[PDB]
Amino acid sequence: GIQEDSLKVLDILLEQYPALITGRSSILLKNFVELISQQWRLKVLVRLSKFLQALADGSSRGSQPNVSSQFRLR
Amino acid sequence: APMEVAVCTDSAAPMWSCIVWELHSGANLLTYRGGQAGPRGLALLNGEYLLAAQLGKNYISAWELQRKDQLQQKIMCPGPVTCLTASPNGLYVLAGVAESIHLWEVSTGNLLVILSRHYQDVSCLQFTGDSSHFISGGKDCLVLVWSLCSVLQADPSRIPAPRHVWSHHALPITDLHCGFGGPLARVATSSLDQTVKLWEVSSGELLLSVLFDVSIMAVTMDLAEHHMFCGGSEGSIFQVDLFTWPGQRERSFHPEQDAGKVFKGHRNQVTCLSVSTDGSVLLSGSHDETVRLWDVQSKQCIRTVALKGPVTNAAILLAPVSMLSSDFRPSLPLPHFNKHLLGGLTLRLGLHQQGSEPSYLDRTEQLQAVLCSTME
């Protein structure tokens, strides 16, 4: 019950500032795997797709010399 | 000093069919007698044979350079020949039949491949100045860049495809000019939609889209790509300056100056242009039965040689040893050009070392070494 309470919180602030949720994700993706590793698993998957959609939506949103080179001595 | 000639042909041919007259003297050098020529249908082969197409008929004549009379060899094609072009080295003769791009070989005489991608007639055929690529364009508003390597060593069951498909025009093409180079050259295709575009043959990209007022029917460029003399459908010979470069990709002529960059004096179309070597006299044909030389530096006429009937082909060459000499029997006879699709090379050896003979000091040193060795 504690985990499902926190899981609801994630859907709350996801709507309002969807861009900045993906900044410090790192750990959170693992946490989704940790609990799962039926119906309880289903409710996790509802916003897990919304979670993965956040990265996709967040990340998605002659006459010039053309002489700049990308070779670097490093 | 070198010698510059100006090959001219007329579409009526009452007496002559290809008159060669000196540039700065106006005197005749060589004439030829035979059937009428064809637009974009003249090409010197190896500097020895003057092949020419035929207007309307489907075959190609062949004149030996030092002979006023037609030879008995006639290249035959299964359809109306439209344009012809011989490769600069002289190894390959390539002609266009209806929509096909029939390709021959001068050495053996075979017919290697018959390429066929245009959807309508082919009305221009040019070879890049090192005979590595040949650009073909036709009345389907398409300009294709083939490659002499891929279209020769392709499997009989591989149907070779063009390297680049340039489709930006909206009306039939009329002329091309492939500059020096090879895989670094630049093409200057021109269509009937009042545009003259300069492409790149290395990557295949547009570079310039000058839009004129009247339909362009001939484009030529200075050998160093300094000027782009685009003909007109009314008589004017417009001139674009590629080294001033206002700095855009889609220009327009009237904002690009006027009345000081236009050759005038013609009364009909100009389906012929060619710039001399140094770049100071421009030769232009027309449809008003006149071939006149210009003065590109000062936009003035020099002479107004008048042919009979419309002018089909006109260009300025650098007179080879053939025209200067009086006999010059050709090195190799023209073979039997086949008309059906297919080792045995026919060539003269001992030409990769011409002049690589020992010098005087080398022979003297060898003789002295022999003497010294004999003394010991």
Distance from the B202 Cα atom to the nearest Cα atom in chain A, whole angstroms: 13
R_g of chain A computed on alpha carbons: 19
Nearest CA in chain A to B207: A62
* B328 close to B66: Cβ distance less than 8 angstroms: yes
Whole-number Å distance between alpha carbons of B140 and B142:
5
Name the phi and psi angles at A20, rounded to 5.
-85, -10
Half-sphere exposure in the Cβ direction for B46 (13 Å, CA): 18
User: At B230, is the secondary structure helix, strand, or coil?
Assistant: strand
Whole-number Å distance between alpha carbons of B117 and B228:
29
* B237 close to B269: Cβ distance less than 8 angstroms: no
Listed in sequence order, the residues at least 6 apart from B11 whose beta carbon sits closer than 8 Å to its beta carbon are B36, B37, B55, B309, B310, B311, B312
Q: Show residues of chain A in contact with B248, CB under 8 Å.
A: 63
Beta bridge partners of B62: B51
**Is there a contact between B206 and A63 if contact means CB atoms under 8 Å apart?**
no
User: At B180, is the secondary structure helix, strand, or coil?
Assistant: coil
Distance from the B185 Cα atom to the nearest Cα atom in chain A, whole angstroms: 15
Name the phi and psi angles at B322, rounded to 5.
-60, -50
**Is there a contact between A62 and B248 if contact means CB atoms under 8 Å apart?**
no
Tokens of residue B222, six digits: 């200075």
**Is there a contact between B205 and A62 if contact means CB atoms under 8 Å apart?**
yes
Neighbour-count burial of B213, counting CB atoms closer than 10 A to its CB (0-12 exposed, 13-18 middle, 19+ buried): middle
Nearest CA in chain A to B248: A63
* B314 close to B281: Cβ distance less than 8 angstroms: no
Tokens of residue B164, six digits: 């680049």
Whole-number Å distance between alpha carbons of B97 and B116:
10
Answer left, alpha or beta for residue B134, where phi above 0 means left and psi between -120 and 50 means alpha: beta
Answer left, alpha or beta for residue A27, where phi above 0 means left and psi between -120 and 50 means alpha: alpha
Tokens of residue B182, six digits: 């090879």
Type of residue found at B178: C
Q: Of B169, B102, B115, B177, give the one whose Cα is nearest residue B142.
A: B169
* B189 close to B160: Cβ distance less than 8 angstroms: no
Name the phi and psi angles at B324, rounded to 5.
-75, -45
Residue-by-residue DSSP string for A5-74: HHHHHHHHHHHHSHHHHTTT-THHHHHHHHHH--HHHHHHHHHHHHHHHHHHHHHH---S----------
Residue pointed to by tokens 């006027």: B258
* B314 close to B274: Cβ distance less than 8 angstroms: yes
Distance from the B200 Cα atom to the nearest Cα atom in chain A, whole angstroms: 10
Distance from the B77 Cα atom to the nearest Cα atom in chain A, whole angstroms: 42
Whole-number Å distance between alpha carbons of B120 and B137:
10
Listed in sequence order, the residues at least 6 apart from B32 whose beta carbon sits closer than 8 Å to its beta carbon are B16, B17, B18, B19, B50, B63, B68
Residue B355 CA: distances (Å) to CA of B90, B350, B358: 22, 11, 9
Tokens of residue B234, six digits: 């009314």
Residue A65 in contact with partner chain B when CB distance is under 8 A: no
Tokens of residue B263, six digits: 């050759």
Q: Of B135, B55, B48, give the one whose Cα is nearest residue B311.
A: B55
Whole-number Å distance between alpha carbons of B153 and B112:
10
Residue pointed to by tokens 């042909």: B9
Q: Of B270, B266, B354, B353, give the one whose Cα is nearest residue B304.
A: B266
Angle between helix A39-60 and helix A27-36 axes, rounded to 10 deg: 160
Residue A63 in contact with partner chain B when CB distance is under 8 A: yes
* B131 close to B91: Cβ distance less than 8 angstroms: yes
CB atoms within 10 A of CB B3: 15
Q: Show residues of chain A in contact with B207, CB under 8 Å.
A: 62
